[PDB]
Amino acid sequence: PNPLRNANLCSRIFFWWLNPLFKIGHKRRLEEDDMYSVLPEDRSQHLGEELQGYWDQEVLRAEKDAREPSLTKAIIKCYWKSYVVLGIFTLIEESTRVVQPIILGKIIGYFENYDPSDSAALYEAHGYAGVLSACTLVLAILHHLYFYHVQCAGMRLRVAMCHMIYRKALRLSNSAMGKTTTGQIVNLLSNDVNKFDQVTIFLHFLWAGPLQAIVVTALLWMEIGISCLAGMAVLIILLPLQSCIGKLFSSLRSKTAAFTDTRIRTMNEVITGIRIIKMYAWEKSFADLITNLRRKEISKILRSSYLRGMNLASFFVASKIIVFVTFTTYVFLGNVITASRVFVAVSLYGAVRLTVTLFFPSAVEKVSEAFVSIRRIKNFLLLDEIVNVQDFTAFWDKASDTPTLQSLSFTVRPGELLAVVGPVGAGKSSLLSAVLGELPPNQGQVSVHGRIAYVSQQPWVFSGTVRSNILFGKKYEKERYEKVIKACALKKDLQLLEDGDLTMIGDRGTTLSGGQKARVNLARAVYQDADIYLLDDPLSAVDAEVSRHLFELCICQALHEKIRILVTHQLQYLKAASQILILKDGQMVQKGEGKVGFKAYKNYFTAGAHWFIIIFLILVNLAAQVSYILQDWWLSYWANQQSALTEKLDLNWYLGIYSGLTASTVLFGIVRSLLVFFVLVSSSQTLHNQMFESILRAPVLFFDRNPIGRILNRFSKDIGHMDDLLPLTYLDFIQTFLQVIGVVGVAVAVIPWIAIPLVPLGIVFFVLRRYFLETSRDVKRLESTTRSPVFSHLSSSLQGLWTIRAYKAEQRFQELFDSHQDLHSEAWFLFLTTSRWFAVRLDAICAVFVIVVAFGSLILAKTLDAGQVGLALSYALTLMGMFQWCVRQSAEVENMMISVERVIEYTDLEKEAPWEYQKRPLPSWPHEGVIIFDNVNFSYSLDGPLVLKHLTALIKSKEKVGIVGRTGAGKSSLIAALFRLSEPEGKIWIDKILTTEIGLHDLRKKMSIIPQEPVLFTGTMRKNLDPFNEHSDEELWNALEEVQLKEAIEDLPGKMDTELAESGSNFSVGQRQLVCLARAILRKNRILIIDEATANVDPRTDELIQKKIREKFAHCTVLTIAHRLNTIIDSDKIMVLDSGRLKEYDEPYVLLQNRDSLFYKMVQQLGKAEAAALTETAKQVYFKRNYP
């Protein structure tokens, strides 16, 4: 529903149909459903289909030639017929813009020749004043039509482009999915396609600027003659100069984007891995790495911002220079300054200033930015894009030494389960992809019948309700739904959830546990009730008991009659499977906010520089605008002084002060524009370092009480604004605000009575502003909140591309994208239309001011000179567009300051205890590795429960101790206390030193940790092992041999200098664990803390790391958290935490022989044979340790 369909022409132009929503919004806060729908022209589907049609056409034409296709060509062939008629606005608007200076000139002419008693003269002047008023209204209306329509053009271009990007993304080949990663594609939408909103704004000025410059040259030629050409020479120097600056700025910005992208990726992994960075004490290395990336980036930003500031200063002072040279040569040729000529010419140059030195350079800049965007988009659009298997062989990459699947033949039929079994990387998932048909055969054939269900190994969940993620477009139905929810072992959680299965889910299921989203992902598949289930190991996404529970209930009971193809290692379940196919090396081996106060402004500007510099900044701004106003006032003063005069003015005095006034205007304009960027970029720099130091020393509790995305937004969005958009908007607002104050000041200074109409007029403005703002900030909230889901959907679909492609769900997912997109388009449509509603009426009251100035000058004409009125009116005419831009820019400024307020708070976080005390331990300390807990109590927060109480234990230099206990019993709490991840109560001694009497780095660097899950960081394999670069390469190779990885690195081209991926996918999980083990080996320390290190490792690798532990750390005291009690059963003693209480600490055999020990209960829970093995092992090692 949209009343713009029903609105009469007047209501279409002036948007009167928004008025009820203004009334509502003033009375109450606007919400998502207070929002009229977009017209059928703007609908995303209809609007993207056309551009794709023309892209197909141009691809075919280039295909018939040999050349590569052009995407700019498809865009033009599509949108030219609509966009070109918009130039009639531009044509009529710019033609009236050059006529209106002529009417102005005839008004000023009445004052130049004002006679005391001619009635007919007065009547004609009133006629021109009415014509001038009407010209102003028509200009305003055409301006607003044009800008409203080009903005809709840009919106539709973005919408169609985004539709195409999304359409292409769904069909990329898995090879294209390899060289392209989610972050790049999402940056397309989030960064590059947003450049199309700006493209269409100024393109009609690529011809109208030059054509209007030629027309203005002819008009000026009749006004003043040859002197016109000096100003036009300056104009044609500015054209190449400003266009070179714009292209060079675009180049610098294109390069700096790389540093920005690298910094944001490093910062993403820092914030994500901050706990391990803290335990390793590697904070110095990331401090350095981020410091250097940020230093490079801020140098690029400083240079880029100086270029942009020079372009802005060149616009601001363009007509000052153009007028200065024009009238300098005009007076050197013997002419005289008159108010009519001067201000007519000043007005014409004002028009040329806008179109040629603002809109034409702006167009070149934005087309350049658009071409880098279009190049990336074409590089994306051109990227590559019963059951029976026989003789199957295939390559992922023909450059491989071998095929990646080979010599494959098998068949499976209704009522069967086929297991795919074997080592990691044996091609099992690749096999499933082949059966799906994602991987075509290079030889052999695949044939399948019925619908296929593909369940990815990693779970996938998208927006909406958890039930929306499960149903996946299917009808909700009680019986099948209940059968699904019970078979997927999920009912309990959906009952415990207060909003049940209607709980809303985040961008990556961040509110869900891994097992929860896993069970969601499986439930989805089972709900589809397909014929063939390709089960790519759904079970490793849940705990071992739930894994067998899902195998029995979902796979055996629910999928009972189906074909199944289950990738798994749980061979113990496969007694119930029909057949197993074993792969190796790809070949078959076997077959069978919203408001901020003055304090935020002060803090922001003072974080940049010492307040003395800010006083100088204010003074430089005042001086810039004062010299501006004064140069124009000087022309008008010169015109009045000429008009008072044979003899002539002293060109030395007048032209000298003119030259000084104009030189200081240029000087302060330049320094003002540069110093704003320096101060505000130094502010962003200081605040980034303060926020980075705070986040580095902030306690872990800060990272529990914030999600990662929320903190990373401070570094991406908010600091992004503070580097790029905010300083530019500040300079824009400051420049426009001082212009407006100068207009009003000149007006009130020339006719003081204007102050009276200005009172009601000012009151109306302020009421209107308030009444608008109330709703304006609502829609800006609602724009942001409807923008975010779009990127979320893109990213989620990219992660789940296998599954949506498997379900043939591309159609519905394009509909979803279009729905999100057109919902955002309604918010963007209210942004556009509401911002026009306000701009129109601001220009309305501004036009009343123009009317008042004009007519009041005629009412008061006995009291004024021609140059006074010419000055006042020229300035008044300039108020149109300026004043509304000022007000809306002010709203932009205040909206961005919410980002500043969000980062300034993170400069004030609480901080952990100092890394080093004034007391420091001996360099030989720890000399023995003694650990003592004595009446220790520990809680993650002062307001939280005591998760550890009365913890009291000794750990000597030689013994090995296991840490055991139920989930949440406090095991991880012990690691947190020992590293002082939260400050413990009580006494902790290490080598007769209280851990609390030394710095955090003293003890953190002297304890080794093997995390629960390995993490690798982008950069060299040397960095991931020796980030401080103090070891010899001999030691690195010894360690890499010990961790059995040397062969892979030497096979890799760079050896240790090979560039690793941020997720380490270059290496297997076991290889990642081996990187961690290598780090621990290279750091010789007395005490090693092991965190569940092998609970999920395969036995044939677990025994390897067990042996490596027995060898490389035999001298160390070792504290081991372990689910896999076989990893710790040969400890000297074991600690059992009941619930924050050390209830057991004794020899494992002595414990287990007490059948009532909690440790014995925990082993018995495993099973009788497991407990028998564990007890026998403990008994024999206890005997042998008593024997020596």
Ligand SMILES: C[C@]12CC[C@H](OS(=O)(=O)O)CC1=CC[C@@H]1[C@@H]2CC[C@]2(C)C(=O)CC[C@@H]12
């Ligand atoms: C033309 C004007 C207003 C007057 C300014 O002159 S200034 O001396 O006050 O800076 C410059 C200026 C800059 C940007 C202009 C603006 C008017 C409104 C415009 C055209 C839009 O919708 C998008 C860009 C906008």
